Every structure is written in C-alpha cells, then in structure tokens.
RNA sequence: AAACUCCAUAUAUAUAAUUUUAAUUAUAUAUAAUUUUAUAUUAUUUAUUAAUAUAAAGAAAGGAAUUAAGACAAAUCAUAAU
C-alpha cells in the first residue's frame, strides 16, 4: 500500500507492525475511498492513535465503560485528588481575565481607589493611605410600589485627609449596607 | 479514437467559419497563435468544474462557521462530539431491551441503587466529625454486556492544601468508600449488583473540586450542609460569597472568539485541500481521481495539516464556562412571621449567544431544557417544615 | 502526553462467553450448554472470582430463593465456595434438552385404562376424547414434567382432584 | 452518433507508417504540462506614473 | 514528508468498506434498536467496519421506520383537567444484513460486537440455516467427537506473550475436553 | 508480580513510589481484614525522605489513622472552601461528559485502526451449501443480553417444487398443509415456539415435516385427487396488502424523443491520455 | 409518466372515469393541459397512493 | 418578547445487492424564507422613506413547546413528602 517496511518500525512500535501488515495485505490498492457525510467516526483533527493521551483517552487502571481490565486489575486506589487534570497550560482562563488574588480584599478602600483611578485618574496610593473614612447616617429607606414595600439601604459618609481635603457622599443600594457605604465612599472621593 | 483527424475536421470548421467555400479564415499563425489558447481555455474550464466537484464531494467540517465569512465551505456539521451533548445523556438510565418488562425491572433497580448510593455517602469518624460526600445523580449505562454507574462526587472538605504529605500514610474516610466500591476482590459492591442485573457492573466516582460545576452537588450542598447560614435569614457574608463565586465574564467576546476560531479551523482545512488540489496532482495524471464515485485527494497528513490533538480539541469544546447562576431558597426559612418566604439570587446571563450568530443550533434536552442549562431542586426538612433549594446554571 | 499502547489480539477464546445464545450449530449448542451449566452452578461469571484471601467476608446472594417472595426472609448472605473445589452439576435431561432436543410429548392414554375405570361405553369414549384434548392442549404451557404429568392425569380422570393439593 | 463514427473510421487510414514516437511524446508532454498542470489558483494562500491607465 | 500513516489508520477517516456479494444468500440479519440514533448509527458504522476485516459481506444500515409511543397526562396533582401534557418515546431501528459467510465467522463477529457494544442499543439477530429435507439426528459418539474436535481446532492457542484469555472460556474448554464429559453422554 | 502487594516481606529496595501504591493496594484490597504488619511499617519508614515527613510521624499515623492526622494538626476543618472563587483549573461536569464522549470515540477509533485488522487471520472461504441438496431453511432468533421468550421460536421454510415429490404426492402434501402453503409463491412455512429451547422446536418441526412427507408419499389408501386446492387464506392475505401491478403501456413508449448525446471534442482529445 | 402523444390517460391501470367518479377531479387533472392547451398532445400514466379522491 | 427547538415543507447527498417494497418509501446530514427584487400612486422626517398597484422568481403557506415578576392566603396535607 502507501508504505511497506518504509522505516515504519522507527515510526510505530513493534507491537502494531503486525496490524499494519495485515491491513496492507487485506485492503487492496486503488481502493475507492469516500468520506462519510451522514455519520462522523474520526476526530476532526489528525491522530495516529499510537499514544494514550491523558485527558483525551480513558485513564488506565480506572473503571470506565468500554474498559478491558477485570475487577482484579484496577490500579487506582486514591481518590483524594482529581484524576486526569487538564492538559497544556492546565488552565482555561478566557482572553483578558486574571486569576483571582487578594486584590485589596481586606480593604474596600483599595477597590474604591482602583475604580476612581480607572474612571478619573486620581492617585490610588493617596486614596488608600491618606484618606479617612467615617459614616454619618446609615438607615433603611422604603418605597411602596405595585409589588409592595421595597426597602433600600441609604448611607452617607464623610471622607477626609485631616489636612484640608474633605468631602461627603451618599450611596443607595438594594442589597446591603456594605454596598451602600461603598457607593457613598466612591461619591465622597469624587466630591472632595 | 484519436484527435489526429478531429484536428483536420476542426480546421474545416474554421474554413466554414470564414466562409463555407473559402480556403481558410483569418490566420495569424495558420490558426495556431490563439486557437490553441482558446482550446486550452475550454479544457481548463472543464478542469474548473471537475475540480470544484472534487472539493465539494470531499468536505466535512465542524459547525460554527459564521455566514458573514467568505472562505467558508458549503459543508457543516453540528454533531461533533465536542459541540453537543449526546441525547443518551439526557436520561439517567441509558438502556434498550426488546423485553419491556425487563426494561422496567432495570429502571426500578437503577432508582433503588441510586438511593442506596445516596444513603451510603455519609460518614462518621469520632462522633463530632460528620463528613458528607455530596454526589450527583447516577448515570446508568446499560450496554449489551456490562452495566456502568457513573457519578460526580464532591467531598465536604478535602485535606488542607497547606498540610504536608502526611495523607500518604493513611486512607481517608472517603478513600475507604471509593475503594470498597470496586477495588475489593470478592467484596466490592459491583459483585453484589451483578446479582440484581445479571451483568458485569462498574462504578466511576469522578471527582469535582468546586460545588458550582454541577447543579446537583451545588443544590445538595446548600440544602444539607449550609442550613445554619440561612435558617433564620440569609447571612450577608454567605450571600457575598455565593454571588462572587465566579467573575463577570464577557459572554459576547467569548462567543465571538469561539466562532472566529471555528472559522479559522474550517478555512485552514479548506486551504489544505486547495493546495493539495493545485500544488499536488503533478506526477499523478488526471482522470485517475474518477470523480464519479471516487474522491481520494492524497495523504491524510496533507489533508489535515497543522491539526493535532494539541490545538484543535480544546478550543472547539462547548459548555466550558459558567456565565450565570440563580439560586432560590423557598419555604419556612424564618422563625418570624411564620409564613412562606422566597429569596432569589440571580447573577450572570442565561442565554448562549454562540447559537445567535453562528450556524450551531441549540437542542432542547427532553424537548424542554435548553442544552446550555442545568438545573436541580433539593428539598430538606427543618424544625418548621420542608424547604427547597432550586439552582439553575448556564454554561457557555 | 505519551503513554505506550499495549495490544492483545481478539482471539476466539477471548470473544467466547459472548457468542449468540441460540445459534444454528452443534458446536454452539455444546458451548451454550456448558455456559448455562456454569451459570446454574454459580460460577464467578459476571463477577470477580473467589480466591482464598478474604476469610470472613466471602459472601454470595445466589440462594435457592433469591428474588422470590414466597419463602419469606431478609437477604440471605451465604458464604461462597473458593474458585477451586466447586462442584459443577451436569443434568443429562438438561443436555438432551439443549443440545439434542428430545421431548417427552405426554405418552397417550388408551381405551383399556378408561374401560377398567368404567364399564359403560359412552363414558369410555368421552374420557378418551377428553384425554386427547388435554394431551394436545397442555403441551404449550411452560411447566415442569412432573407437574404437567399430574395435571394431565387429573384432567383426564385417572388421579383424584385431591392429588392437586386443593 | 452522426459525427464521431465518421471521424473514428479514419484513424486506420491515417496511422500509415510514418515515425511518430518523438512527436507524440512531445505532444503528450505538452498536454500534461499545459492542460493537466495549469494552476487555477496560485500560491499557498508600484508607482502610478501614468494617469488614466484604464483610459 | 512527515511520518507515514498506513491504510489501517487512514481508513478511520473515510466511510466503512464493504465486500461484494458473490452468491446472494442471507446468513444473518441484525436489527439494532435504540432511543438515540447517534449511538445507533455510530455502532452500525463500527459493525460495518469490522465486517470488512473479518470478511463478512454486510449490506449496510438500512433505516427502518421509527416507532412513536405517545401518552397524555394531566399537569396537576389534583383537579385541573383542562390542561394536559403529552409525552413521546421514539424507537429508532437500523438493519444490517450479512450474506455469504460461514457460521463460525458470523459467530465471532457477533461476539466481538457484543464485547464492544455501546450504551443504549439493543441487537436482535435472525440467523438462517440451510438444511436438507431429512436429517440424521441419532449420531452421538462420532457426532460429539467431531464437534469437540471442531471446538479444539477453533479455540486453539499458539501465542503466549500477546493476546488475552477469559477464565470462563478456559474453564469451558477444560470441562468440555474431559473424560467425564465423554461419559456424560450415555452413562445411563 | 500482581500478588506482590500481598507479601510485605519483599518490599525491600523498592523505590518509595513503589512501596507506596503497594501499601495503598494492601489497604484498598483487604479492606475489612487489614492487619498492621511490622514489615509494612518498616518498608514505609524508608519513604520519610521521599515524602518529607518524620518517621515518628509515620509510626503514629500507621498506628492511629485519621485520628493521627487530627492529632498532628489542631482543630478540625473550619475554613469553608466550598464557595472559593473559581481558579479556572477545572472543567464543568457537562464539559466532562462531552470529553467522555470524545474519549469513547477515540477508544473505538483506536480499535478500528489497530485491533480490527488483527481478526483478518480468521477469514475463511465461504463453502456454499448446494441449493439443490439444501432446500429447507431454518430460522432462529436471538436477543443478545436478554431473556426474551421469543428466543425459543424456530421457523422452517421450503419450496414445494423442491421437495422431490411426484405430482400426486405434491398435491396431497399441499392439501394436507392447508393454510401453511401459499401457491402464489409456492412456499411452505411453519414455526414452533411450544418448547422452552430451540433445540426441541427445531426437532419438532423436522418431525412434522417428515411425518407430512411420509403421509404424502403414502398414496395406497387415498390420494386426494378429487379434492382441489384451497386458496381462501391466500385471498384473505392478498386483500390486506395494497398491490401495484399496473405497468406502463408498451405502445405509449417513444424512444424517438429521448435525449441524444451531443458531440464535444474535449473528451475525444483528452481521453487518449 | 408523461409521454407525448394523443389525449390518453390511465390512472392506476384503470380508466379515468372508473378511478375518479367525480367530475371536478378529472377537470383538476386536466387543468395544466388546458392552460398549456396540450390536452391532446400527451399521454399520462398516473400511479397514486394515499389520501382520498381529491388528494390524489 | 423575538430568534434557537419539535411536527410539517421543498431540494440535494448517503444507506436498501427493491423477496421486511410501501423506491409513490424509510431516516441520517446539509441547504432554503422572519422571502427577494423591478417600475405605479398617495404621500412624506427626501429620498435613505413607508401603504398599496403586481411585470417578474420562488416549492415556500402552517402548526406546538415555551405563558416572566407579582399577585387571587385560588386548588392540592386523597400522587407522594412534610
Ligand atoms: Mg400487514
Ligand atoms: Mg419565544
Ligand atoms: Mg405570571
Ligand atoms: Mg378548599
Ligand atoms: Mg401520605
């Protein structure tokens, strides 16, 4: 057929040469092959099927339908870790996304500073180190609508650097006082 | 038979072209300077027709080609294993037997063994360590020779990552369970199930690290292990974590790049086939393709160029990111007011915009669940009554 | 990303135990008879074998009443024999019913028995007709040899109907 | 049916005995190179000094 | 240019190959049923691919009509009868006809496809046997002797490094090739 | 080889990764009657440098278990990692289902590439039974991996003209077969499912065939020449299948209007090759 | 099966009046022929299955 | 909400050695439409505009699944669970 003993041993393991030989001597040359359009059987990519690829072929020694090991041949005995992790880089981050980190989670002033730098170019270092935060009023505000009483969280906050700069901001949220004061702090920093 | 005389016939036709009784027509080189070129023109037009037949009747590509594209070929296929969930996965029990009574028997057995598997997960260590191993539903696979029970499990708390390798010298309360499932020689649960199914049985505990990668595990965990955080009211910290489990992904951009990648895949396969259609075929003379029924271009390595297992498989897979989730707590989760309460936490989106701009078409599981949605309800009992945790997740 | 692929050709021995249960071949009948004998004798087919490694937990569920309500009890766990020393039962009736294909056919009853029972002639003729009808109508029912024999006798009129365990 | 038979029944006459090997080999090479090896689409994948060139 | 890809691996990427019928007799008829045409057709393609290598002329996956069970049930646990909901179940049927093949080759085909049957599919096999009008059915000694000889020559072994074996098959041959089985015929 | 894990004595000189995966094997197997073994303990202490754990810790972990781990550390698990923000290091369950579909595809494709070729060793030349000498056809049914009762049914079909009967016995045979013979096709068909296994059903059909043939050949007492053949069952069958026997009238055919083949010299000048 | 000729029609191997007792059905069969005024220029051999008279 | 989807529509392609014939068929895949233009007339955010007129080209015209939030302390503790 295409290649008989053409260095085929160097490219395929000896265990398969018998199968290739049998195929050469059973499928005739000039066979009028035709691609199938009703059903799909081969992968969209091209593979010689001579190596068991992790995460794309069943892990040996682990139970799975279409397995050929007996109940006394399984070689998996630990289940505290994810069998068959992801290939390549081992991660599936979309384009333009970052792994979550601390990100100043310990202080929402860091988030406020980053947002205000993004929006208007003020100094995150200054906002995070030289500004003092102080709520003044934190109360529940209600609206009566068709469905019923919709309660809202209202906060007002003063932010000041103790050296002349001062501002106040009001923030209204629907879910939590924390988001209310976050919005208020944002507005105050804007309105210094 | 042979053109040696058809040439003379056509020369006579040229004479007629000038006049039916004239010697010859206007001849720059005795009708050879451009008549031969026109003959070659018609021959190459015949080649064009045969060639586009050649390419068309040998086309097979994954679906996802944006119609706006120009180089996209006429062929398309959505049934690629990586781009749609096989409908056999819709049903928890995957069987067909010509004996309907046996079929009913087997579905009964599947349900009962599933409930047993649920009951067999909880564990004790020292009377103040209660470990619950949340497990999804069981996927029963009934081949003609062997039965397989496959499920996804999430341990309540894996051993601390900061902890040293000390885990290598003892087997956890969960490792013991998973080992007695199918590793013990004459004692494994598969041996017992073989009596009920008169078949060879297998079990697969696929591990999951996060609870929100599956709708069953997520709802089960909320309804069984997080009661104290919402019994008298949903804790704000719990709500914050539950709402920020996943970042705000740009579904539009994700879908657009997926479609563009499929476009590139198809176009580069098309280019491979075209270069085999033109650059090759030199030594091998024409008419050996026998385009009537044979369509073999050449070496499969050349038809599939720069398409290995390292780049193609992963970028075409679907249902990969969680871009939306909704949680509903309903029932008497409040000592005060003694009434029903519903709390809904909705984040993200619930539409796959991949199907909106490409040729890939959605398929409804059980004819009512969109392919991209996975949802589950779990009911439990507290001192006030029954309450339900309903979770819906959208994967893009 | 590389792992060796080990090969083992699919020899007929490997493909055995999965030949059609009903095939047109005396060889197939012999093979299927042996497999059915193993299944009835509780060979470790469809499950892992019992080797003498586990001493306390070596149990099986293939009790005579498995799957049957009538006796009445909980799931009985019976200690299972080791792979060796396992007695295999071969029923000659099972052989002549799966391999060769012999059938009993309910050997008829003739006028002498009914004449002995009753002196009248019309009764004898009617009883013979009854026995013929029962003989040609009771074969299609899937039943055991002894029980079918008893039913045939009772409905013919030989044994009293008390033999049926009223 | 009304043309091809007449043209094909003249090859027996036109064969004659003149040497043709070289000429027919050259003609066959010409057909292979031009008709059968023409590239319909090529490849893997100045100063406009004169105005009104199309003119 | 690159590493060679032989015909065996190049065949996976094209439609399965068939062997022409040279006489025309139908030896077997395999009907595949499932609720999932995807697995149904994938497995049918696998069958048609193994038949070629094993030398069995197979016709191909003839699609027989699909059967639609229908039910209608009310949507409410209690009285709401004006609203009802319909449920359906489709059974998909494919047919593969095997012509001009020896019974043992056909046996081994069925055995291999059972070995590697998918999930959610079912096989019904109709086997046809040509026979003479009158059959000699009293042959016991020479009969079983020749039958066991055929068993031995079929399920033989010549390679001990490669290949796989079944304990059940080993025991089956062990008990078949035994003097107690020889006398089990007519020990009466 | 395989039984190495059952012999903790020969766990000497093995690499730590092999002493492990054998200790784990002994713990997985022997799950309920595992007993501590000094040989296992000694072979395990050699892996202290492998796993960077103290030997004094290995001993007490071996002799206590999970209680030993909670002794090594302080309070039990307290931090709730259930809602830990996603790291994009793992794939959802539905994605894993799709990946499993692809894994199955690759399994079957490797089979078709390398294992199916190896069963061409068993190709055999087809010995066709002589159709003259094998007129009867026995049909068997099998339901793989099931217990369908119909698996016991066997059918027998022959053609009457191929029985080897002279006209009189053939007529008698048809008459005695009654509804099991359709003259329009000349096929005698009869099936049996009244015995549990096919072996019997086939023998029973063969016996009825022999009995019918014997009676047909016996024309000394009665030959049933006066009785014509009954076809009413065949008529009933025919009424239940729509028939399409009409054929296109032959005089309406007009070949003189069929499409002719146009002459083009491209094929005549390119077919020489 | 339509082949040029006279105005002959055979429906399911039967005459038009035999198969179609309704006049409107015969007129409907004709209609193409009369819009192209070739009623007497083609022979029709029609074989139908399913539905009723009007459908066929 | 629309689309995506299922039953239907047309075309192709693939299977059936047309004696499971219904090839006038079966069901796998793909294409097509939530139709295009051309001049007419009223008009009018001016042409980039609709409503019609209907030369033309098209096989192309339906059906059902899906019924949000809030409510009526609507029905359901007799489907089961509480
Ligand atoms: Mg019928
Ligand atoms: Mg809608
Ligand atoms: Mg509503
Ligand atoms: Mg009431
Ligand atoms: Mg109740």
Tokens of E157: 């072994």
Chains C and F touch (3+ CB pairs under 8 A): yes
Q: How far apart are CA B197 and CA B200, in angstroms?
A: 8
- Residue F5, classed as helix, strand or coil, is helix
Which H or E element spans position G11?
Answer: strand G9-11
3-state helix, strand, coil in chain E (%, to 5): 35, 25, 40
Going from the C-alpha of C164 to that of each of C109, C134, C154, C155, C156, the distances in angstroms are: 20, 16, 8, 10, 13
Which residues of C are less than 8 Å from B190 in CB distance? 47-48
Instruction: Tell me how many helices (H) and strands (E) chain C has.
Output: 6, 2
A132-144 β-sheet, strand order: A132-144, A149-160, A166-173
E82 Cα–ligand 4 center, Å: 19
**φ and ψ of B379, to 5 deg:** -110, 140
| Displacement of CA E151 from its chain's centroid (Å) | 20
Q: After which residues is chain D broken (C to N over 2.5 A)?
A: 45
User: Which secondary structure element, helix H or strand E, spans residue A120, and what is its range?
Assistant: helix A108-120
Note whether F156 and F205 are within 8 A (CB): yes
Could you give the C-alpha distances from F258 to B344, C134, F262, G1, in angstroms and in order?
A: 75, 71, 12, 14
Bridge partners of residue B329, in order along the sequence: B343, B389
* Structure method: cryo-EM
Q: What share of chain A is helix, strand, coil (3-state, %, to 5)?
A: 25, 20, 55
Residue whose C-alpha is closest to residue E38's, from E104, E94, E84? E94
Taking alpha carbons only, the member of G23, G24, G27, G3 closest to residue G46 is: G3
| DSSP for F51-73, written as a single string | HT--HHHHHHHHHHTHHHHHHHS
What's the distance, CA F184 to chain centroid? 37
CB contact under 8 A, D35 and F263: no
Q: How many residues does chain A have?
A: 192
| Tokens found for residue F33 | 């009657």
- What counts of helices (H) and strands (E) characterise chain E? 6, 4
Straight-line distance from CA B337 to C1' H80, in Å? 28
Residue F241 alpha carbon to ligand 1 centre in Å? 6
Bridge partners (DSSP) of residue B150 are B139, B204
Mutation target to probe the A interface, by most A beta carbons within 10 A, among C5, C44, C51 is C5
Residue F25's nearest CA partner among B187, A78, B173, B165 is A78
Rounded to whole angstroms, what are the CA distances from G18 to A88, G10, G46, G53?
77, 10, 13, 12
> Residue E39: its chain B contacts at CB < 8 A?
86, 88
Vertex C151 angle, CA C146 and C155, to 5°: 150
- How many angstroms separate the alpha carbon of residue A89 from the centre of ligand 2? 41
Is beta strand B123-124 parallel, antiparallel or unpaired with respect to B130-131?
Answer: antiparallel
- Number of helices (H), then strands (E), in chain F: 11, 4
Return the structure tokens found at B285: 């003379």
Angstroms from E142 CA to nearest CA on chain B? 35
Please tell me the distance in Å from B345's CA to the nearest CA on chain D.
52
Q: What residues contact C72, with CB distance under 8 A and at least 6 apart?
A: none
* C103 contacts on F by Cβ (under 8 Å): 195, 200, 203-204
DSSP code of residue D15 = H
Query: B145 with E115: CB under 8 angstroms?
Result: yes
| Rounded Cα gap, residues F88 and F80, in angstroms | 19
Residue of G3, G38, G48 lying closest to G16 (CA atoms): G48
The Cα E86–Cα B179 span in angstroms is 44
Rounded Cα distance between E57 and E18, Å, is 6
Helices (H), A121-176: 124-129
| C47, C57, C66: residue with CB nearest B194 | C47
Name which of F199, F178, F214 is nearest F190 in CA terms: F178
Q: Which secondary structure element, helix H or strand E, spans residue F168, and what is its range?
A: helix F167-177
SS3 C57: coil
- The Å distance, Cα B377 to ligand 4 centre, comes to 28
HEC-encoded secondary structure of F78-138: CCCCCCCCCCCCCCCHHHHHHHHHHHHHHHHHHHHHHHHHHHHHHCCCCCCCCCCCCCEEE
The CA R_g of chain G, rounded to the nearest whole Å, is 11
| 3-class secondary-structure state, position A134 | strand
Output the CA–CA distances (angstroms, integers) from residue A157 to A152, A191, B313, in the order listed: 16, 11, 53
Let me know: does B72 contact B263? Beta carbons within 8 Å: yes
Question: Would you mind telling me the total number of residues written for chain G in this entry?
Answer: 56
Output the DSSP codes for E117-138. Answer: --BSEEEEEEEEEEE-SS----
Q: Which tokens go with F230?
A: 């009954």
**F79 vs F168: CA distance, rounded Å:** 98
Alpha carbon of A55: minimum distance to chain B alpha carbons (Å): 11
Q: Which residue of G has its CA nearest to F249?
A: G45
Q: Give the whole-angstrom CA distance, residue C145 versus residue E38.
A: 47
Distance between CA atoms of E7 and A33, rounded to whole angstroms? Answer: 11
3 state SS for chain B:
CCHHHHHHHHHHHHHHHHCCCCCCCCCCCCCCCCHHHHHHHHHHHHHHHHHHHHHHCCCCCCCCCCCCCCCCCCCCCCCCHHHCCCHHHHCCEECCCCCHHHHHHHHHHHHHHHHHHHHCCCEECCCCCEECEEECCCEEEEECCEEEEEEEEEECCCCCCCCCHHHHHCCCHHHHHHHHHHCCCCCCHHHHHHHHHCCEEEEEEEECCCHHHCHHHHHHHHHHHCHHHCCCCCCHHHHHHHHCCCCCCCHHHHHHHHHHHHHHHHHHHHHHHHHHHHCCCCCCCCCCCCCCCCCCCCCHHHHCCCCCCCCHHHHHCCCCCEEEEEEEEEECCCCCCCCCEEEEEEEECCCCCHHHHCCCCCCEECCCEECCEEEEEEEEEECCEEEEEEEEEEEC
Of A16, A51, A87, the CB nearest to C3: A51
- Residue F215 contacts residue F175 (beta carbons within 8 Å): no
Residues whose CB is less than 8 angstroms from the CB of residue B66 and which lie 6 or more positions away in sequence, other chains included: B72, B259, B260, B263, B357, B358, B359
The helix (H) or strand (E) run that includes residue E70 is: strand E62-74
In B, minimum Cα distance to A90 occurs at B314
Question: What's the longest Cα–Cα distance across chain G?
Answer: 29
Give the three-state DSSP class for G43: strand
Whole-number Å distance between alpha carbons of B29 and C71: 110
Question: Which is it for strands E121-131 and E26-34: parallel, antiparallel or unpaired?
Answer: antiparallel
Residue contact F122–E105, C-beta within 8 A? yes
Strands (E) located in chain A: 132-144, 149-160, 166-173
Distance (Å, whole) CA A1 – CA A25: 8
**Residue E39 vs residues B11, B362, E46, F106: alpha-carbon distances, Å:** 63, 19, 10, 14
Q: Assess B366–E contact: CB distance below 8 Å, yes or no.
A: no
Query: Which H helix or E strand runs over E182?
Result: helix E179-184
CA distance B182 to chain F (A): 10
Specify burial of residue A83 (Cβ count, 10 A radius: 0-12, 13-18, 19+): middle
Say if CB C25 and CB E151 are below 8 A apart. no
Query: Could you give the dihedral angle defined by the CA atoms of residues B111, B116, B122 and B127, in that order, rounded to the nearest 10 degrees?
Result: 150
DSSP letter at F178 equals G
Return the percent helix, strand and coil in chain D, to nearest 5.
45, 0, 55
Distance of CA A99 to the CA centre of its chain: 8
Residue B106, both tokens: 């087997």
Chain E's closest residue to F163, CA to CA, is E133
| Chain D nearest-CA residue for F262 | D1
Rounded CA gap, F96 and B234, in Å?
A: 32
Count of beta carbons in the 10 Å neighbourhood of residue E11: 25
**How many whole angstroms separate alpha carbon C152 and alpha carbon C107?**
10
DSSP classification of residue C164 = G
Tokens representing D6?
A: 């007449």
């Amino acid at each position: 057929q295409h290649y008989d003993e053409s260095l085929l041993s160097r490219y395929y393991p000896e265990s398969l040469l018998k199968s290739i030989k049998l195929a050469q001597q059973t499928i005739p040359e000039d066979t009028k092959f035709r691609v199938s359009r009703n059903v799909e059987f081969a992968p969209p990519y091209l593979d010689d099927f001579t190596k068991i690829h992790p995460f794309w072929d069943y892990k040996p020694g682990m139970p799975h339908l279409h397995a050929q090991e007996e109940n006394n041949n399984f070689s998996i005995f630990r289940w505290d870790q994810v069998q068959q992790p992801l290939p390549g880089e081992g991660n599936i981050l979309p384009p333009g996304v970052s792994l979550p980190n601390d990100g100043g989670r310990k202080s929402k002033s860091a988030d406020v500073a980053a947002g205000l730098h993004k929006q208007t170019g003020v100094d995150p270092d200054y906002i995070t180190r030289k500004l003092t935060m102080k709520p003044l009023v934190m109360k529940r505000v209600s609206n009566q609508t068709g469905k019923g009483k919709i309660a809202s969280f209202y906060a007002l906050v003063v932010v000041g650097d103790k050296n002349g700069m001062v501002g106040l901001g009001e923030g209204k949220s629907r879910e939590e006082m924390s988001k209310a004061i976050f919005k208020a702090h944002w507005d105050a920093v804007r309105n210094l | 038979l042979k053109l040696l005389n058809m040439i003379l016939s056509m020369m006579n036709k040229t004479n007629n072209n000038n006049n039916i009784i004239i010697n010859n027509t206007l001849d720059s080189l005795m009708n050879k300077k451009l008549l031969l070129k026109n003959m070659l023109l018609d021959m190459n037009n015949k080649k064009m027709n045969n060639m586009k037949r050649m390419l068309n009747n040998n086309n097979m590509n994954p679906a996802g080609a944006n119609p706006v594209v120009h180089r996209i070929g006429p062929a398309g296929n959505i049934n690629n294993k990586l781009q749609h969930l096989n409908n056999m996965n819709n049903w928890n029990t995957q069987i067909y037997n010509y004996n309907k009574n046996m079929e009913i028997m087997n579905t009964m057995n599947d349900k009962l063994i599933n409930k047993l598997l649920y009951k067999m997960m909880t564990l004790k260590l020292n009377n103040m360590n209660i470990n619950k191993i949340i497990m999804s539903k069981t996927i029963n696979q009934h081949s003609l020779n062997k039965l397989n029970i496959k499920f996804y499990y999430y341990n309540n708390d894996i051993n601390n990552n900061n902890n040293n390798n000390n885990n290598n010298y003892y087997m956890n309360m969960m490792n013991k369970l998973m080992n007695i499932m199918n590793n013990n020689m004459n004692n494994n649960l598969c041996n017992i199930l073989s009596y009920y199914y008169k078949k060879k049985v297998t079990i697969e505990p696929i591990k999951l690290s996060y609870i929100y990668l599956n709708s069953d595990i997520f709802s089960k965990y909320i309804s069984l292990n997080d009661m104290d955080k919402y019994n008298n009211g949903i804790l704000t910290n719990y709500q914050r974590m539950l709402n920020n489990i996943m970042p705000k992904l740009n579904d539009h951009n994700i879908s657009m790049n997926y479609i563009n990648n499929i476009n590139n895949i198809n176009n580069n396969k098309y280019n491979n086939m075209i270069n085999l259609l033109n650059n090759n075929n030199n030594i091998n003379n024409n008419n050996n393709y026998n385009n009537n029924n044979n369509n073999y271009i050449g070496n499969i390595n050349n038809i599939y160029n720069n398409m290995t297992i390292d780049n193609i498989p992963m970028d075409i897979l679907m249902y990969k990111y969680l871009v939306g989730w909704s949680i509903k707590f309903k029932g008497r989760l409040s000592n005060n007011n003694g009434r029903t309460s519903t709390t809904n936490l909705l984040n993200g989106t619930f539409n796959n915009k991949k199907y909106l701009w490409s040729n890939i078409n959605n398929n409804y599981k059980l004819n009512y669940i969109p392919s991209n949605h996975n949802l589950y309800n779990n009911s439990n009992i507290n001192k006030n009554g029954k309450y339900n945790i309903k979770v819906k997740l959208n994967f893009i | 990303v590389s792992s060796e692929y080990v090969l083992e050709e699919p020899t007929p021995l490997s493909l055995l135990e999965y030949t059609p249960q009903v095939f047109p071949t005396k060889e197939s009948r012999l093979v299927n008879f042996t497999l059915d004998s193993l299944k009835k004798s509780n060979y470790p087919i469809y499950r892992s074998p019992n080797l003498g490694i586990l001493k306390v937990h070596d149990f099986t569920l293939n009790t005579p009443n498995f799957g049957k309500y009538t006796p009445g009890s909980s799931l009985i766990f019976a200690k299972e024999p080791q792979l060796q020393n396992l007695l295999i039962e071969e029923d000659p009736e099972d052989f002549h019913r799966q391999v060769t294909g012999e059938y009993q056919l309910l050997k008829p009853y003739v006028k002498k028995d009914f004449e002995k029972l009753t002196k009248s002639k019309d009764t004898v003729s009617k009883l013979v007709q009854n026995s013929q009808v029962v003989r040609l109508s009771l074969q299609s029912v899937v039943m055991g040899s002894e029980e079918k024999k008893l039913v045939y006798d009772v409905c013919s009129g030989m044994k009293p109907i008390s033999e049926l365990q009223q | 049916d009304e043309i091809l038979p007449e043209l094909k029944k003249s090859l027996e006459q036109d064969k004659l005995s003149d040497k043709e090997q070289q000429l027919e080999a050259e003609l066959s090479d010409f057909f292979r190179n031009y008709a059968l090896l023409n590239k319909l689409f090529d490849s893997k994948t100045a100063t406009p000094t004169k105005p009104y060139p199309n003119l | 240019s690159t590493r060679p890809y032989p015909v065996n691996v190049e065949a996976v990427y094209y439609a399965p190959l068939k062997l022409p019928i040279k006489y025309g007799d139908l030896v077997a008829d395999i009907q595949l049923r499932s609720y999932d045409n995807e697995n149904l057709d994938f497995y049918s393609d696998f069958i048609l691919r193994t038949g070629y290598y094993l030398g069995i002329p197979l016709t191909g996956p003839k699609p027989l009509p699909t059967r639609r069970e229908r039910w209608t049930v009310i949507k409410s646990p209690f009285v709401h009868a004006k609203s009802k909901e319909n449920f359906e179940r489709h059974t998909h049927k494919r047919l593969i006809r095997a012509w001009d093949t020896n019974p043992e080759v056909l046996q081994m085909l069925i055995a291999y496809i059972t070995k590697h049957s998918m999930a959610g599919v079912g096989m019904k096999c109709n086997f046809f046997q040509r026979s003479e009008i009158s059959l000699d059915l009293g042959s016991d000694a020479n009969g079983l002797e020749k039958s066991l000889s055929n068993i031995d020559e079929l399920y033989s072994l010549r390679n001990d490094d490669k290949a796989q074996t079944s304990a059940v098959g080993q025991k089956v041959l062990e008990l078949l090739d035994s003097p107690d089985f020889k006398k089990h015929l007519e020990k009466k | 080889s395989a039984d190495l894990y059952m012999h903790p004595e020969k766990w000497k000189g093995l690499p730590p990764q092999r002493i492990l995966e054998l200790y784990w094997e002994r713990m997985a197997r022997l799950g309920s009657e595992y007993k501590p073994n000094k040989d296992e303990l000694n072979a395990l202490l050699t892996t202290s440098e492998y796993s960077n754990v103290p030997v004094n810790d290995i001993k007490k972990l071996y002799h206590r278990g999970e209680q030993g781990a909670i002794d090594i550390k302080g309070g039990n698990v307290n931090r709730d990692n259930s809602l830990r923000p996603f790291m994009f290091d793992e794939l959802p369950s539905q994605a894993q289902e799709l990946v499993a579909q692809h894994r199955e595809q690759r399994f079957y494709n490797r089979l078709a590439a390398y294992e199916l070729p190896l069963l061409a060793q068993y190709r055999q030349e087809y010995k066709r039974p002589s159709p003259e000498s094998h007129p009867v056809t026995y049909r068997y049914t099998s339901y793989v991996g099931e217990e369908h009762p119909n698996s016991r049914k066997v059918v027998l079909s022959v053609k009457t003209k191929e029985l080897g009967l002279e006209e009189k016995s053939l007529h008698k045979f048809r008459i005695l077969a009654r509804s099991r013979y359709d003259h329009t096709t000349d096929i005698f068909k009869m099936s049996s499912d009244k015995f549990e296994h096919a072996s019997q059903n086939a023998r029973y059909l063969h016996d009825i065939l022999q009995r019918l043939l014997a009676e047909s050949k016996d024309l000394t007492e009665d030959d049933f020449s006066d009785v014509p053949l009954d076809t009413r069952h065949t008529i009933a069958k025919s009424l239940r299948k729509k028939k399409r026997d009409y054929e296109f009238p032959e005089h309406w055919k007009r070949p003189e209007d069929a499409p002719k083949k146009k002459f083009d010299i491209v094929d005549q000048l390119l077919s020489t090759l | 099966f339509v082949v040029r000729g006279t105005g002959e029609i055979l429906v399911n191997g039967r005459q038009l009046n035999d198969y179609f007792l309704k006049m409107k059905d015969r007129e409907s069969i004709m209609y193409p022929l009369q819009v192209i005024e070739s009623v007497g220029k083609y022979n029709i051999f029609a074989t139908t299955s399913g539905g009723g008279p009007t459908g066929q």
